[PDB]
UniProtKB/Swiss-Prot annotation, chain A:
The lineage of its organism: Bacteria, Pseudomonadati, Pseudomonadota, Alphaproteobacteria, Hyphomicrobiales. Fluoroacetate binds at residues 108, 111, 152-153, 216. This is Fluoroacetate dehalogenase. Belongs to the AB hydrolase superfamily. Epoxide hydrolase family. It comes from Rhodopseudomonas palustris (strain ATCC BAA-98 / CGA009). Catalyzes the hydrolytic defluorination of fluoroacetate to produce glycolate. Has lower activity towards chloroacetate and bromoacetate. Residues 29-261 form the AB hydrolase-1 domain. Changing residue 107 to N: Loss of enzyme activity. Keywords: Hydrolase. It comes from the Bacteria. The keyword Membrane does not apply. Pfam families: Abhydrolase_1. Its EC number is 3.8.1.3.
From Swiss-Prot, chain B:
Changing residue 37 to A: Reduced catalytic rate. Minor effect on substrate affinity. It holds the Pfam family Abhydrolase_1. Keywords: Hydrolase. Gene3D superfamilies: alpha/beta hydrolase (3.40.50.1820). The record marks 131 as: Important for enzyme activity. The keyword Amino-acid biosynthesis does not apply. Disulfide bonds: none annotated. This is Fluoroacetate dehalogenase. It comes from Rhodopseudomonas palustris (strain ATCC BAA-98 / CGA009). It catalyses: a haloacetate + H2O = a halide anion + glycolate + H(+); fluoroacetate + H2O = fluoride + glycolate + H(+); chloroacetate + H2O = glycolate + chloride + H(+).
Length: 290, 297
């Protein structure tokens, strides 16, 4: 497995739920970067250097993903809910002395991020969310067309062991197919092969696949109900925010229902912005967080 | 594999789209029985002998299923659309000299059956649909709750090879868990083990799994569109119809099924039966009786 973060250290950070792995580089204001599915912290490798020109950049594996430890789940999927993941990453950040920080997330990491902002806004200076709408909004949309497009939201959320059993036969196919599927190009040409190797090795472990299914189970159930409470309360995130999304993968209208200070923009890309459009993404983030 | 229809003959019936395999028994008015997913004709094994006391019963494997031939599909999944399957079965019945016949279908076969009724009502004297609502009705309702409860409609409809590959590592496990899951009790006790073996052997063939995915791809696309035309146009089936469904099955999970069917059909009766989604196996005596009574009247 290649080292894709020149000038970054490697830390295991203790929490009450298990270790969080991160790569850590730069100096200046702290900025936490959170990946999504079916990826690891490595997805930030094309943008984390430009950010580390200005910031102390902490590139963390989500609870249960990558090299982070895997807390034991329960019947309500609790450690893999975005509320619980957020709490665990807040504890991790406190081990480094960071109690007020900038945050950018992608895909499931973006879900952690906006949930963290909703639950504990005082922890964040500024928030960026990449390639998502709120969980609740995806579910509200979920008609025929959306059920076909984002079938994995319902498939991965099926009770165990249904998706686990299917995934075990040829996991390398499935993960590579998802990576390719969600890009504009429809192939793996947007990704560094060494990055793809990281994602494949993680996905090859049954215990890591189980976590991903627990994440999607939470997304179907507790995450949705948590979001529904905020929508019904009319709670909006107060933290200055940026929404970026791949134009092939409005979203600003949606976010304005969830956040009182939000700017954003499409970038021509599929759903892997930091790898498909690294310069544009790095530039939008540096300019937003600076 | 066991012979579950002791005394019935066989037929391998030619059509323009490939052979249809059927068991044939009894004597009297003609009655075609059409299985669904993930089954074969053998699902009728507990009701067909009773029906054969009153009817000439034709128990057919759907196009692409069981021992029927597998036509090569195309980009629109055409041979596995219900419209094309219905045309194919009409041709098979004409080979037997049946141009006007009774029809009962279960699950995908039921979907063949109502589409047949909408496209070619002259072919049918009476129609029974078991364990279903129209395809259009399932997609119209597909919100979060339903997407989570009937995930396989969207999973199996993903572009090839995604479901095919997922299914190839341990196909037995998947099919057996579906058979059990869809019953009232959640286990395989409602099935004759010999029937289950027919189902598992079918599912063990990758070509047969491909067909099942093409069937669901058609269900997501052309079948939905065909249905949409009918319901937007206000077309109803004029053929006298019976709708039966298991009280624990999905047709009733967020619908009143008779109310739904009355929107699609101008002369429909029906009832629930205490069962999951496999009526002819879970409640064979009740199902047999309801079918004999409806088709005999
Ligand atoms: Ca002939
Ligand atoms: Cl620590
Ligand atoms: Cl019975």
């Amino acid at each position: 497995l290649a080292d894709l973060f020149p000038g970054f250290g490697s830390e295991w950070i203790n929490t009450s739920s298990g270790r969080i792995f991160a790569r850590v580089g730069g100096d200046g204001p702290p900025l936490l970067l959170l990946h999504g599915f079916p990826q690891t912290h490595v997805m930030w490798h094309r943008v984390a250097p430009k950010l580390a020109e200005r910031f102390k950049v902490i590139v963390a594996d989500l609870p249960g993903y990558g090299w982070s430890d895997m807390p034991e789940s329960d019947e309500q999927h609790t450690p893999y809910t975005k509320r619980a993941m957020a709490k665990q990453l807040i504890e991790a950040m406190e081990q480094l002395g960071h109690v007020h920080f900038a945050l950018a997330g992608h895909d499931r990491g973006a879900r952690v991020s906006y949930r963290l902002a909703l639950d504990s806004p005082g922890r964040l200076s500024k928030l960026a969310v990449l390639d998502i709408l709120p969980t609740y909004e995806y579910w509200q949309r979920m008609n025929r067309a959306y059920a076909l497009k984002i079938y994995h939201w319902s498939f991965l959320a099926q009770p165990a062991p249904l998706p686990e059993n299917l995934l075990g036969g040829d996991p390398d196919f499935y993960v590579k197919a998802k990576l390719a599927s969600w890009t504009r190009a429809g192939d793996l040409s947007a990704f560094d092969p060494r990055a793809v190797e990281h994602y494949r090795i993680a996905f090859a472990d049954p215990m890591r696949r189980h976590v991903m299914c627990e994440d999607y189970r939470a997304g179907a159930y507790a995450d949705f109900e948590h979001d529904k409470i905020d929508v019904e309360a009319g709670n909006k995130i107060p933290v200055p925010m940026l929404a970026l999304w791949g134009a092939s993968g409005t979203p600003l209208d949606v976010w304005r229902k969830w956040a009182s200070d939000v700017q954003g923009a499409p970038i021509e890309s599929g759903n892997f912005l930091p790898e498909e459009a690294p310069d544009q993404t790095a530039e939008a983030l540096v300019r937003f967080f600076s």
